[PDB]
Amino acid sequence: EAKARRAKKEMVEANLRLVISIAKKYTNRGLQFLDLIQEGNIGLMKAVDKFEYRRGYKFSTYATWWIRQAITRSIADQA
DNA sequence: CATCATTGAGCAAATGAGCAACACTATTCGCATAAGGTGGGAGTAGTGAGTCTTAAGTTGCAA
């Protein structure tokens, strides 16, 4: 279990540049920036929880959906 | 001697505000999306006077 968590932390630590890169889009919707980066961090955590590698795709395309889920979810109910 | 007004006394009829209990539906909430997308951006520019605080530079001075 601890080994698996080390792997998952390691992957998240890889994909932070992805999450700020997508985080540039929806900035000025009446919320602050680091709220977006943290929500997106949650979203990529969930995307790590739901990714499989034997599918054969690049991780980012699958991850994108969970990130927009977290962002648009968060600004949606935090209007 | 009779009687009634006149003071208590309480009631049915009626009604206004509920109550619980089921039963049904509107709304809300929470989860998903697969080729790929892996460092922000606005940030002011024409105050001045003072006062407290560090920080550093210098400088006697004594063992």
Residue numbers in the entry: 369 to 447
Excerpt from the paper describing this PDB structure:
Bacteriophage Q protein has served as a paradigm for studying regulation of transcription elongation. Through its engagement with RNAP, Q renders RNAP resistant to terminators. The Q protein of bacteriophage 21 (21Q) was characterized as sharing a conserved mechanism of action with Q proteins from other lambdoid phages. To investigate how Q renders RNAP resistant to terminators, and to visualize sequence-specific interaction of Q with QBE, we determined a crystal structure of 21Q at 1.45 Å resolution and a single-particle cryo-electron microscopy (cryo-EM) structure of an intact 21Q-engaged arrested complex at 4.08 Å resolution.
Consistent with the result of GreB cleavage experiment, RNAP is arrested in a backtracked state at position +14. Nascent RNA from +6 to+15 forms a 10-bp RNA-DNA hybrid with the template-strand single-stranded DNA (ssDNA), while 5’ 5-nt RNA threads into the RNA exit channel. The structures show that two 21Q protomers (QI and QII) bind to the direct-repeat QBE site. QI has a large conformational change of a short helix, H2, which is detached from the main portion of QI and moves 30 Å away from its original location. The loops L1 and L2 connecting H2 to the main portion of QI also move along and form a ring-like structure with H2. QI and QII contact subsite 1 and subsite 2 from different faces of the DNA helix, making similar protein–DNA interactions. As expected, the mode of interaction of 21Q with QBE subsites—binding of the second α-helix (H6) of the HTH motif in the DNA major groove—is similar to the mode of interaction of σR4 with −35 element. The main portion of QI sits on the exterior opening of the RNA exit channel and interacts with β' dock, while the ring inserts into the RNA exit channel and interacts with the zipper, lid, zinc binding domain (ZBD), flap, and β C-terminal region (β CTR). Taking advantage of the flexibility of the flanking linkers, the FTH moves 30 Å relative to its position in RPo and binds to a groove on QII. According to the structure of 21Q-engaged arrested complex, the ring-like structure of QI inserts into the RNA exit channel and serves as a gate.
